[PDB]
Amino acid sequence: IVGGQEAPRSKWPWQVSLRVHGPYWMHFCGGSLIHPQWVLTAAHCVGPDVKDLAALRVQLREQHLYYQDQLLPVSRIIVHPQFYTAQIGADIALLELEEPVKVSSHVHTVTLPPASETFPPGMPCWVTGWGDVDNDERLPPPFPLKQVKVPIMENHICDAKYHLGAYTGDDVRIVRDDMLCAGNTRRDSCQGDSGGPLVCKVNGTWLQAGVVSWGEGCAQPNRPGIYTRVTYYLDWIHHYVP
Amino acid sequence: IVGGQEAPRSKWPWQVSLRVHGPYWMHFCGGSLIHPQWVLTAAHCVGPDVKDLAALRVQLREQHLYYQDQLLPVSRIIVHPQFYTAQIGADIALLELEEPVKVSSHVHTVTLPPASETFPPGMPCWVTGWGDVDNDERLPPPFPLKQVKVPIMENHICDAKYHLGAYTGDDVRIVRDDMLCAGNTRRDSCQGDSGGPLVCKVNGTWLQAGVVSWGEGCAQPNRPGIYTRVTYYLDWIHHYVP
Amino acid sequence: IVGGQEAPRSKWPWQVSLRVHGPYWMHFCGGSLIHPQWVLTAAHCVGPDVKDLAALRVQLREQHLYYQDQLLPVSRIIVHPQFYTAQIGADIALLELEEPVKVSSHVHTVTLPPASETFPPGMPCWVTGWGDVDNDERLPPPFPLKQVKVPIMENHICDAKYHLGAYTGDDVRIVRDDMLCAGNTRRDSCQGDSGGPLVCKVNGTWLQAGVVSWGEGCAQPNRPGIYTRVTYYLDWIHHYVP
Amino acid sequence: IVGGQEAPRSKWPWQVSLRVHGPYWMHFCGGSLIHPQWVLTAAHCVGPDVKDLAALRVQLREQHLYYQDQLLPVSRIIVHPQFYTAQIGADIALLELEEPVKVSSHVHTVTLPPASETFPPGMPCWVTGWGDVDNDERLPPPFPLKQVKVPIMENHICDAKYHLGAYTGDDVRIVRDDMLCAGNTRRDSCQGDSGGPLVCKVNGTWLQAGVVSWGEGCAQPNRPGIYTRVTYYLDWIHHYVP
Ligand SMILES: NCc1cccc(C2CCN(C(=O)c3ccc(C#Cc4ccccc4F)o3)CC2)c1
Ligand SMILES: NCc1cccc(C2CCN(C(=O)c3ccc(C#Cc4ccccc4F)o3)CC2)c1
Ligand SMILES: NCc1cccc(C2CCN(C(=O)c3ccc(C#Cc4ccccc4F)o3)CC2)c1
Ligand SMILES: NCc1cccc(C2CCN(C(=O)c3ccc(C#Cc4ccccc4F)o3)CC2)c1
């Protein structure tokens, strides 16, 4: 997370940490609890290559990474079949926990948006995670969960920004319809926030608008953060999630 | 270049080295002389972002990188407008030298293939460059130009190979029609060879079949080297090159 | 700490962490509370060059580094005047805290040994710290305080061990009288443990026998851990510490 | 080498490169040809630990490192028996080549100084090598042999300089009698120059005053380059070299 601050303990109960086996269970991506037994994440965190289920653990909301770990095994990794790169799209995946979680006030699910949902240019949206604090700048220990309010940038506006200082023809779509933009040069998601949530408050309800996917660097001029647009994958999510 | 050997001094007269300004004019990509004033390379070497022309130099065929440098300025960088990532495709670019080169026996152009040329399996093809000798293994000093004979793999066989050990749906094309596959677990191109040529001997004539583009690592099981298919961009090349 | 385990919360109340100002107050050396207002450490942690007092903080006993920091400023850094490198010796320093600490059961001083105490082989001795778990292997997050029981080696034997597989003449003393040896190929102190304590239980009292100083790597054959022998510097320590 | 320039082809015929076996025969230290079958170097380049003779090669004068390698095996590594660290001293070693070299105008021996030879300030002295061009700044390819004219500083003035901004007592000798100082903030030897020569022109004859040994960084204020004083080891050199 670029800019913003350490999240209050009561905020973002759906935030999860994805862990890889090694010298320690290291954080590699974020995610969100969307059902007591399901985690929503980015496909690029777990693919396109198939990896061993035993080498993965899920960690529920934690104020400080690694401090009070209670690691959860995964029974299934479901990666969107259209996925191979974040720039092509379909950067979405589902993790089925071996067991459902005991939902509380401090740890509970995020609401997915309705199929119609549009996120207008400049809505109140927040991105959260334990990712880098800037380009090649790690989140320092004790690794607090960070948050940052990010402005929505309309797809066409965002796509035109990606063409500034680039050779790509104006007629060539970089920001696809299954993608969403948010952030600026002071507020953004970064490496390590991938797979984590972009939540917008709509009519007093927090809705997950996006999944942290890609971009050119973090908080770079004319390069807003690119998110997987959740509404585009609602049917695919609902085929697996009750 | 993974496998193969140091190229004889009389071989590959069209091979060029792309140099970036810094503590020294460092090699970052390969290229090929296709006309006395034109270099063919990969778009990912010079894009998608526009960089300063002054920060780039072209070095003609050199036995050992850096030892007998005679650097050449560039007046134009022409990147295919469809390009943004090597995985999407259109990974091709043209560099116009400020001045034409004095063509000789040791330094001369490569022949582009006719539109009809397919390059089927069994064809004798060679990849050249000063790139990595294996994954995260730099070409050691004195940096000799290397070559490796690589087997051609049918696009469909290659696409199926890229689906092995991956979540990507079989109906999702990874290796596109504008791409070409070459290499195996002992013979391949690697980081630093990008932009360079894949040449095939057809009826006693060396034809540039491909441009080193991408792949998953270097000489990895079920991951052949992926090349930009030159024949697909002949009309675009001919719009700029006489 | 090589080998051993995470220390119980009730053990080693005198253990301190030395912190350097940067992106975060990073651990760089250990130390020990020898008086409510004095920290004993290694001179190589703070010298031979004079550094800014404002760039240093002391952290009292912490179960997990960085997680519950209450940083303490220093008013004086007193480095043994004989010191320039750990291999020559006099690798000892004193830090005067700006304020005395409120001593409790969980955080209190270690006892210095009497001048007569030699610590022969067979003495139960423990070395503690947040240093590397092996050669070029950092202590993983959440960074627990580790301990390891180490066997003492009599000086002349340790000096002769340092000559094995080395060109240094047998008559040339490597391990000096102001030094103490402890550890083997499974149990040792390592980078980041420097300045921290080696404590031995003598007549039901924990005495600080040494200060983690140097060695050739960590737990390497014929290279035991070298400590500054506390008894040798008692007069110098008493010139500053009540 | 910090400052100075690329050496002319006719200069420093005695300069050698020490090579270690790995992905390539990599330069790790310099040396000097003092006899057709003997190389003078620093003990720290080859010790204090004993390494395999097969893992070492000597490369004679080369304008550009790695370009025209003709590596030479070594039959004996003789390290001064007083050596363990460069800060203590006796940082000198001898390499006996398996075969003598065919001496020419481009490749020949350096003259050792007479025992009476003091090299006072004002004497024209050069240090040569393929080492770093500054602190953490590698010599760029094609790796030319560099030279730098360095001012001699008297030992007591140099000793006092090493005490500036350090805790070490003024009565504690850092720069020993078996050492020699040269260089300033614009001229110095650096990592990779170690073992190489410091030569002074005395009565039309080039004499090797020193062996690159140590210092605190490269071209740092109040930290001149420290050399092993050759005159101090003439008897030891003469035990082995005719
Ligand atoms: N700040 C949002 C965000 C969140 C998580 C991870 C990242 C990564 C994604 C990959 N990274 C890249 O630099 C990267 C990979 C591909 C591209 C291009 C691009 C681009 C730029 C101009 C025009 C067209 C393009 F495709 O950028 C590192 C940052 C970025
Ligand atoms: N061996 C030929 C070659 C020549 C030059 C440069 C490379 C690079 C290209 C980028 N690299 C990658 O590892 C890379 C970037 C994107 C992918 C995927 C993939 C993939 C795997 C299974 C299914 C679908 C995929 F897109 O791999 C490093 C090697 C490779
Ligand atoms: N296990 C003890 C320990 C505790 C804290 C920090 C270290 C460092 C000290 C410096 N290191 C070295 O490898 C080092 C620095 C100098 C020497 C030599 C030596 C030597 C070997 C044979 C004979 C004489 C010697 F002085 O080794 C890395 C670990 C080692
Ligand atoms: N003069 C340039 C030069 C040439 C060859 C090799 C080096 C090395 C020697 C080791 N290095 C150090 O930084 C180093 C190692 C030990 C010391 C201290 C010291 C010191 C400083 C003040 C007082 C007393 C000291 F012993 O410095 C890096 C470069 C430096």
Side-chain angles (χ1 to χ4, degrees):
Chain A
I1 298 297
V2 183
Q5 60 177 314
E6 164 156 8
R9 287 187 149 270
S10 60
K11 285 202 114 177
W12 333 114
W14 47 78
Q15 179 78 48
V16 314
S17 173
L18 305 198
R19 310 295 192 75
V20 62
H21 182 71
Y24 67 105
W25 285 98
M26 188 182 71
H27 170 94
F28 69 89
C29 270
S32 63
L33 194 70
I34 58 153
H35 178 274
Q37 209 168 341
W38 296 87
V39 166
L40 184 64
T41 195
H44 85 252
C45 291
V46 292
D49 295 337
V50 177
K51 307 161 299 174
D52 189 358
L53 247 63
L56 176 80
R57 292 298 180 271
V58 168
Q59 164 68 48
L60 302 176
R61 202 214 192 275
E62 215 165 38
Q63 189 63 25
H64 298 285
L65 262 194
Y66 315 113
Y67 197 32
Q68 290 257 85
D69 289 358
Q70 290 190 279
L71 312 165
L72 310 173
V74 168
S75 54
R76 267 200 292 173
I77 303 164
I78 304 112
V79 181
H80 200 287
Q82 293 295 309
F83 179 84
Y84 63 117
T85 86
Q87 294 76 30
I88 292 152
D91 193 15
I92 198 156
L94 288 166
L95 311 174
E96 190 184 38
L97 307 162
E98 234 148 63
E99 290 304 324
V101 306
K102 291 182 175 178
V103 147
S104 69
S105 180
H106 192 262
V107 49
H108 69 75
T109 76
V110 66
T111 310
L112 297 173
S116 63
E117 230 71 4
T118 58
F119 300 89
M123 222 205 199
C125 308
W126 295 74
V127 62
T128 58
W130 299 271
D132 290 357
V133 300
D134 220 324
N135 297 290
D136 311 304
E137 233 167 86
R138 307 285 95 72
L139 173 67
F143 322 107
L145 177 61
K146 281 192 75 198
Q147 66 187 34
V148 70
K149 196 187 179 293
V150 286
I152 294 285
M153 182 173 298
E154 194 271 335
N155 273 44
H156 295 99
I157 304 306
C158 181
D159 196 35
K161 273 186 158 50
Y162 266 78
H163 289 82
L164 295 161
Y167 293 103
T168 318
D170 295 324
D171 56 308
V172 183
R173 208 178 281 131
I174 300 165
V175 188
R176 317 276 186 98
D177 293 357
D178 78 310
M179 297 169 192
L180 184 155
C181 303
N184 58 30
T185 64
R186 305 171 305 282
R187 313 181 269 281
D188 206 356
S189 52
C190 202
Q191 293 90 239
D193 295 315
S194 285
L198 173 70
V199 294
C200 305
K201 206 176 184 182
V202 190
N203 284 308
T205 297
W206 286 105
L207 301 178
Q208 193 180 338
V211 180
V212 177
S213 182
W214 69 285
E216 190 204 296
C218 313
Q220 300 284 60
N222 298 321
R223 304 293 186 263
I226 303 164
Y227 298 78
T228 306
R229 185 177 288 275
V230 171
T231 57
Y232 200 99
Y233 300 96
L234 283 170
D235 295 3
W236 179 80
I237 294 161
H238 295 136
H239 180 278
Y240 297 106
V241 188
Chain B
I1 298 295
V2 183
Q5 59 176 314
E6 162 156 14
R9 291 174 170 271
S10 62
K11 285 202 112 177
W12 333 113
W14 45 78
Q15 179 78 50
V16 313
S17 173
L18 307 197
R19 310 294 192 77
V20 62
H21 183 70
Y24 69 105
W25 284 97
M26 188 182 68
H27 170 96
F28 69 87
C29 270
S32 63
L33 194 71
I34 59 153
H35 178 274
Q37 211 168 338
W38 296 87
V39 166
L40 185 64
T41 195
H44 83 253
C45 290
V46 293
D49 297 337
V50 173
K51 302 165 231 304
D52 189 359
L53 245 62
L56 179 77
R57 292 298 180 271
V58 166
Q59 166 66 55
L60 302 175
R61 209 224 186 257
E62 212 164 38
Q63 190 53 42
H64 297 286
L65 263 194
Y66 315 113
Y67 299 86
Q68 287 250 287
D69 290 359
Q70 291 190 285
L71 303 174
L72 310 173
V74 168
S75 54
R76 267 200 292 173
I77 302 165
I78 303 113
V79 179
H80 201 286
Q82 294 295 309
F83 177 84
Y84 64 114
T85 84
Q87 294 75 31
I88 292 147
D91 191 17
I92 196 156
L94 288 165
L95 309 175
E96 189 185 38
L97 305 162
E98 288 221 309
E99 288 305 321
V101 305
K102 291 173 170 179
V103 147
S104 70
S105 184
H106 190 91
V107 49
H108 69 76
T109 77
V110 67
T111 310
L112 294 175
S116 61
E117 214 65 57
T118 49
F119 311 94
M123 195 140 289
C125 309
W126 296 74
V127 67
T128 59
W130 298 272
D132 289 3
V133 300
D134 224 307
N135 300 282
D136 311 308
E137 235 181 274
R138 306 286 96 71
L139 170 69
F143 321 106
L145 177 62
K146 280 192 74 196
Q147 65 187 35
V148 71
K149 199 184 176 297
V150 285
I152 293 294
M153 185 173 284
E154 201 156 14
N155 270 43
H156 92 277
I157 306 292
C158 189
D159 184 57
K161 274 186 162 48
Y162 266 79
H163 290 81
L164 296 161
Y167 294 102
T168 317
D170 296 319
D171 57 308
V172 183
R173 204 177 272 136
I174 298 164
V175 176
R176 319 275 187 97
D177 286 5
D178 78 310
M179 297 169 191
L180 183 156
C181 290
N184 58 29
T185 65
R186 315 255 166 270
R187 311 168 165 89
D188 206 357
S189 52
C190 202
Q191 296 88 239
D193 294 315
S194 285
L198 171 72
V199 294
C200 305
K201 206 176 185 181
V202 189
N203 284 305
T205 298
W206 286 105
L207 301 178
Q208 191 179 340
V211 177
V212 179
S213 181
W214 69 286
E216 193 206 286
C218 308
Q220 302 284 58
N222 297 322
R223 305 293 187 262
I226 302 164
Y227 297 79
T228 307
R229 186 176 288 275
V230 177
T231 57
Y232 199 99
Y233 299 96
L234 289 167
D235 296 340
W236 180 81
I237 293 161
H238 297 137
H239 177 279
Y240 302 96
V241 183
Chain C
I1 296 299
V2 183
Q5 59 175 313
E6 163 155 8
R9 292 176 172 271
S10 61
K11 285 202 113 176
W12 333 113
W14 45 79
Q15 178 78 51
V16 314
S17 174
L18 306 197
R19 309 294 192 77
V20 61
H21 182 72
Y24 69 106
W25 283 99
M26 189 182 70
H27 170 95
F28 68 90
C29 268
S32 63
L33 194 70
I34 59 152
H35 177 274
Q37 211 168 338
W38 296 87
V39 166
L40 185 64
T41 195
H44 84 252
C45 290
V46 293
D49 297 337
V50 179
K51 304 217 165 291
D52 187 357
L53 207 71
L56 180 66
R57 292 298 180 271
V58 167
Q59 170 59 46
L60 300 176
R61 208 216 179 268
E62 215 164 40
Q63 193 53 32
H64 298 286
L65 263 195
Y66 316 113
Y67 298 92
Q68 292 256 84
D69 290 357
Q70 289 189 279
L71 307 171
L72 309 173
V74 172
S75 53
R76 267 202 292 174
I77 302 161
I78 302 113
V79 178
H80 202 286
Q82 291 300 314
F83 178 83
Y84 64 116
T85 89
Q87 293 75 32
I88 290 144
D91 191 15
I92 197 157
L94 288 165
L95 309 174
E96 190 186 38
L97 305 162
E98 289 221 332
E99 288 306 322
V101 306
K102 305 256 146 293
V103 288
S104 70
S105 183
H106 192 261
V107 163
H108 70 75
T109 76
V110 68
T111 310
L112 296 174
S116 64
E117 189 57 62
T118 47
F119 312 94
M123 223 65 143
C125 310
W126 296 75
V127 65
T128 60
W130 299 270
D132 291 357
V133 296
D134 220 324
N135 299 288
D136 312 302
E137 235 167 85
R138 308 285 95 71
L139 173 68
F143 321 107
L145 177 62
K146 281 192 74 198
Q147 64 188 36
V148 71
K149 199 187 177 294
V150 285
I152 291 293
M153 195 172 289
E154 200 285 329
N155 272 43
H156 300 81
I157 320 317
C158 177
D159 181 44
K161 272 184 164 271
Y162 267 78
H163 289 83
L164 299 161
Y167 292 101
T168 321
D170 297 324
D171 58 308
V172 183
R173 208 180 311 247
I174 302 163
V175 178
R176 322 274 187 98
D177 288 5
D178 77 312
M179 295 170 189
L180 184 155
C181 300
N184 59 28
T185 67
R186 301 167 270 100
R187 310 168 163 266
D188 206 358
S189 52
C190 202
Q191 198 63 257
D193 294 315
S194 285
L198 171 71
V199 294
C200 304
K201 206 177 185 180
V202 190
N203 284 305
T205 296
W206 285 105
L207 301 178
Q208 191 179 340
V211 179
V212 180
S213 182
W214 68 286
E216 191 206 296
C218 312
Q220 301 284 60
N222 296 319
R223 306 293 186 263
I226 302 164
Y227 297 78
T228 307
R229 183 176 289 276
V230 172
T231 58
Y232 200 99
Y233 300 96
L234 286 169
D235 293 345
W236 179 81
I237 293 162
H238 297 140
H239 254 267
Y240 303 96
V241 186
Chain D
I1 297 298
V2 184
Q5 59 176 314
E6 162 157 1
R9 292 172 187 276
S10 60
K11 285 199 117 176
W12 333 113
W14 46 78
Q15 177 78 52
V16 317
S17 174
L18 305 198
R19 309 295 191 77
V20 61
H21 183 70
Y24 69 105
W25 285 100
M26 188 182 70
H27 170 94
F28 70 88
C29 272
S32 64
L33 194 71
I34 58 153
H35 178 274
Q37 210 168 339
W38 296 86
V39 166
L40 185 64
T41 195
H44 85 251
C45 289
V46 292
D49 300 332
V50 181
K51 303 165 229 186
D52 188 359
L53 268 166
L56 178 72
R57 292 297 181 271
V58 167
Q59 172 56 46
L60 297 178
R61 211 217 180 266
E62 216 164 38
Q63 191 54 41
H64 303 110
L65 260 195
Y66 314 114
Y67 184 52
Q68 292 261 86
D69 289 357
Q70 185 95 265
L71 310 179
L72 309 173
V74 173
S75 54
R76 267 201 292 174
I77 301 165
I78 304 112
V79 179
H80 201 286
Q82 294 294 307
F83 179 84
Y84 63 117
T85 103
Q87 295 74 32
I88 291 148
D91 193 12
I92 197 157
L94 288 165
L95 310 174
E96 189 185 38
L97 305 162
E98 290 219 311
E99 290 304 323
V101 306
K102 303 255 147 299
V103 146
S104 71
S105 182
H106 194 262
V107 49
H108 58 260
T109 77
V110 68
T111 308
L112 297 175
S116 291
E117 214 59 64
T118 60
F119 296 90
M123 195 141 289
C125 310
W126 279 260
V127 68
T128 60
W130 298 271
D132 286 1
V133 300
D134 222 320
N135 300 286
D136 311 304
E137 234 172 80
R138 247 44 56 196
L139 172 67
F143 322 107
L145 178 61
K146 281 191 74 197
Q147 64 188 38
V148 70
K149 198 186 182 295
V150 285
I152 296 283
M153 188 181 290
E154 225 194 318
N155 273 45
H156 68 104
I157 289 142
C158 179
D159 184 38
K161 275 186 206 305
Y162 266 78
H163 290 80
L164 296 161
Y167 291 101
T168 318
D170 297 323
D171 58 307
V172 184
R173 207 180 289 131
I174 299 166
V175 172
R176 320 274 187 97
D177 290 7
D178 78 311
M179 296 169 189
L180 184 155
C181 308
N184 60 30
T185 67
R186 315 262 182 99
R187 304 155 185 283
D188 207 355
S189 50
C190 205
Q191 189 203 75
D193 294 316
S194 284
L198 172 71
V199 296
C200 305
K201 206 177 186 181
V202 189
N203 281 304
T205 297
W206 286 106
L207 301 178
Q208 190 180 340
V211 178
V212 180
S213 181
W214 68 286
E216 192 204 295
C218 313
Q220 301 284 60
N222 297 321
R223 304 294 186 262
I226 303 166
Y227 298 78
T228 306
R229 185 176 289 277
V230 175
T231 58
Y232 199 99
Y233 298 96
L234 288 162
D235 292 4
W236 179 81
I237 293 160
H238 294 134
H239 290 163
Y240 303 96
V241 185

